[PDB]
Motif scaffolding. Structure first.
Motif, PDB file in Angstrom:
ATOM      1  N   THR B 133      45.707  24.489  31.736  1.00 24.67           N
ATOM      2  CA  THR B 133      44.443  25.217  31.668  1.00 24.67           C
ATOM      3  C   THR B 133      44.122  25.874  33.004  1.00 24.67           C
ATOM      4  OG1 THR B 133      43.697  23.547  30.077  1.00 24.67           O
ATOM      5  CG2 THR B 133      42.040  25.065  30.954  1.00 24.67           C
ATOM      6  N   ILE B 134      44.377  25.164  34.104  1.00 25.00           N
ATOM      7  CA  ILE B 134      44.206  25.735  35.438  1.00 25.00           C
ATOM      8  C   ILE B 134      44.942  27.068  35.537  1.00 25.00           C
ATOM      9  CG2 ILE B 134      44.959  25.370  37.860  1.00 25.00           C
ATOM     10  CD1 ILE B 134      42.371  23.945  37.319  1.00 25.00           C
ATOM     11  N   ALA B 135      46.250  27.049  35.266  1.00 22.73           N
ATOM     12  CA  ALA B 135      47.066  28.249  35.418  1.00 22.73           C
ATOM     13  C   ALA B 135      46.613  29.355  34.473  1.00 22.73           C
ATOM     14  CB  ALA B 135      48.537  27.912  35.178  1.00 22.73           C
ATOM     15  N   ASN B 141      41.665  35.392  34.992  1.00 19.47           N
ATOM     16  CA  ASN B 141      40.771  35.960  35.997  1.00 19.47           C
ATOM     17  C   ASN B 141      41.468  37.051  36.800  1.00 19.47           C
ATOM     18  OD1 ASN B 141      38.784  34.246  35.137  1.00 19.47           O
ATOM     19  ND2 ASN B 141      38.530  33.170  37.092  1.00 19.47           N
ATOM     20  N   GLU B 142      42.721  36.812  37.198  1.00 23.14           N
ATOM     21  CA  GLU B 142      43.456  37.819  37.955  1.00 23.14           C
ATOM     22  C   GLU B 142      43.666  39.079  37.127  1.00 23.14           C
ATOM     23  OE1 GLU B 142      45.616  34.078  40.124  1.00 23.14           O
ATOM     24  OE2 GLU B 142      46.481  35.080  38.375  1.00 23.14           O
ATOM     25  N   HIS B 143      43.982  38.920  35.840  1.00 24.80           N
ATOM     26  CA  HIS B 143      44.156  40.084  34.979  1.00 24.80           C
ATOM     27  C   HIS B 143      42.860  40.873  34.849  1.00 24.80           C
ATOM     28  CE1 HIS B 143      43.703  42.185  31.191  1.00 24.80           C
ATOM     29  NE2 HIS B 143      42.993  41.182  30.710  1.00 24.80           N
ATOM     30  N   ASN B 148      38.362  45.257  36.256  1.00 24.39           N
ATOM     31  CA  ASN B 148      37.141  45.515  37.014  1.00 24.39           C
ATOM     32  C   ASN B 148      37.338  46.665  37.996  1.00 24.39           C
ATOM     33  OD1 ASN B 148      34.735  44.101  36.454  1.00 24.39           O
ATOM     34  ND2 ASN B 148      34.649  43.329  38.563  1.00 24.39           N
ATOM     35  N   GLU B 149      38.412  46.596  38.783  1.00 21.80           N
ATOM     36  CA  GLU B 149      38.672  47.642  39.769  1.00 21.80           C
ATOM     37  C   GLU B 149      38.886  48.987  39.083  1.00 21.80           C
ATOM     38  OE1 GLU B 149      38.989  50.251  41.917  1.00 21.80           O
ATOM     39  OE2 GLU B 149      38.455  48.480  43.095  1.00 21.80           O
ATOM     40  N   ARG B 150      39.629  48.991  37.973  1.00 21.62           N
ATOM     41  CA  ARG B 150      39.850  50.229  37.234  1.00 21.62           C
ATOM     42  C   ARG B 150      38.534  50.817  36.744  1.00 21.62           C
ATOM     43  NH1 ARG B 150      39.654  49.867  31.510  1.00 21.62           N
ATOM     44  NH2 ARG B 150      40.185  51.852  30.502  1.00 21.62           N
ATOM     45  N   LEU B 151      37.656  49.972  36.199  1.00 25.87           N
ATOM     46  CA  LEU B 151      36.369  50.456  35.712  1.00 25.87           C
ATOM     47  C   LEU B 151      35.556  51.066  36.843  1.00 25.87           C
ATOM     48  CD1 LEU B 151      34.572  50.405  33.038  1.00 25.87           C
ATOM     49  CD2 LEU B 151      36.902  49.490  32.909  1.00 25.87           C
ATOM     50  N   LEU B 152      35.510  50.394  37.995  1.00 26.56           N
ATOM     51  CA  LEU B 152      34.749  50.930  39.120  1.00 26.56           C
ATOM     52  C   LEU B 152      35.304  52.281  39.561  1.00 26.56           C
ATOM     53  CD1 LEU B 152      33.609  48.353  41.846  1.00 26.56           C
ATOM     54  CD2 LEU B 152      32.254  50.057  40.626  1.00 26.56           C
ATOM     55  N   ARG B 153      36.630  52.379  39.683  1.00 27.60           N
ATOM     56  CA  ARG B 153      37.245  53.626  40.130  1.00 27.60           C
ATOM     57  C   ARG B 153      36.970  54.756  39.143  1.00 27.60           C
ATOM     58  NH1 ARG B 153      43.567  53.341  38.977  1.00 27.60           N
ATOM     59  NH2 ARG B 153      42.496  52.567  37.106  1.00 27.60           N
ATOM     60  N   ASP B 154      37.135  54.479  37.847  1.00 26.95           N
ATOM     61  CA  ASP B 154      36.915  55.511  36.841  1.00 26.95           C
ATOM     62  C   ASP B 154      35.456  55.942  36.816  1.00 26.95           C
ATOM     63  OD1 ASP B 154      35.766  56.067  34.045  1.00 26.95           O
ATOM     64  OD2 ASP B 154      37.880  56.578  33.762  1.00 26.95           O
TER      65      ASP B 154
END
Lengths: 100, 168
Positions: B133-135, B141-143, B148-154
């Motif tokens: 479950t940890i992994a 979260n990493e995915h 998140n970054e893509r949404l902000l940039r777009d």
């Protein structure tokens, strides 16, 4: 009722209610006072009456923190002295005071 | 096969922590398997539909509310409503948990666990599922951070293009 049959009745009507008589009576007083003082504002309590023979069974159901709370008042016809001193003489006093 | 591991401080030993793994296949109503461990031994027990039904009607409550309280206690979903206490005798293997409020105790439930000969395997299974479950959570979260970054940039790009459109 005194503090010898309170525990018996509480355990009989609630097989998993391990409480001292003091806590049970405090909870009962807290449950009953708001209803008597003011007519059915909380509305959390539920009351039922049964008349068998000369006795009266008054069943009270409540939600103690969302969990069942059952109680059963067993009432027998009051003696002439109690009814007298509680209803007859006081009412005569009130009538005389109102006439004055 | 949903699972939940929780920490409970047994009344017999206050400082020591006991760990409580409850698993159910479809829903908690049908029944669940419970394992109580402390690192050196494990006690396993089962609760089928008939037993939970007997508990519900014997207490003379609505089954849904009983299940809600049982989940709030065992699954550790308790809020500030009120506290619970668990008891467990090692020589009797008789677990039981109750809800304590105003010095008034309600024996909410009681199960009969049983000692399992091999504790190493159960402990290892617990920790292995735990790290799994940890992994999985790390991966999710990493995915999602990349999204998140893509949404902000777009959003930045489209905001700039709207600025150009209105200016022109």
């Amino acid at each position: 009722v005194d503090t010898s049959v309170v525990s018996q009745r509480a355990k009989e009507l609630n097989k998993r209610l391990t409480a001292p008589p003091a806590a049970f009576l405090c909870h009962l007083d807290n449950l009953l006072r708001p209803l008597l003082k003011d007519a059915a504002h909380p509305s959390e309590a539920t009351f039922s009456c049964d008349c068998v023979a000369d006795a009266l069974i008054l069943r009270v159901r409540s939600e103690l923190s969302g969990l069942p709370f059952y109680w059963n008042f067993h009432c027998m016809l009051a003696s002439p002295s109690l009814v007298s001193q509680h209803l007859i003489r006081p009412l005569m006093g009130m009538s005389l005071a109102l006439q004055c | 096969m949903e699972r939940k591991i929780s920490r409970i401080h047994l009344v017999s030993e206050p400082s020591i922590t006991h760990f409580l793994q409850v698993s159910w296949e479809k829903t908690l109503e049908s029944g669940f398997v419970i394992t109580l461990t402390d690192g050196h031994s494990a006690w396993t027990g089962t609760v089928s539909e008939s037993e939970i039904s007997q508990e519900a009607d014997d207490m003379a409550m609505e089954k849904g509310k009983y299940v809600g309280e049982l989940r709030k206690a065992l699954l550790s979903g308790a809020g500030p409503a009120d506290v619970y206490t668990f008891n467990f005798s090692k020589e009797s293997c008789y677990f039981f948990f109750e809800k304590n409020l105003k010095d008034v105790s309600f024996r909410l439930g009681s199960f009969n666990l049983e000692k399992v000969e091999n504790p190493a395997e159960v402990i290892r299974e617990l920790i292995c599922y735990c790290l799994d479950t940890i992994a999985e959570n790390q991966a999710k979260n990493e995915h999602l951070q990349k999204e998140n970054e893509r949404l902000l940039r777009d959003w930045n790009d489209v905001q700039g293009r709207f600025e150009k459109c209105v200016s022109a």
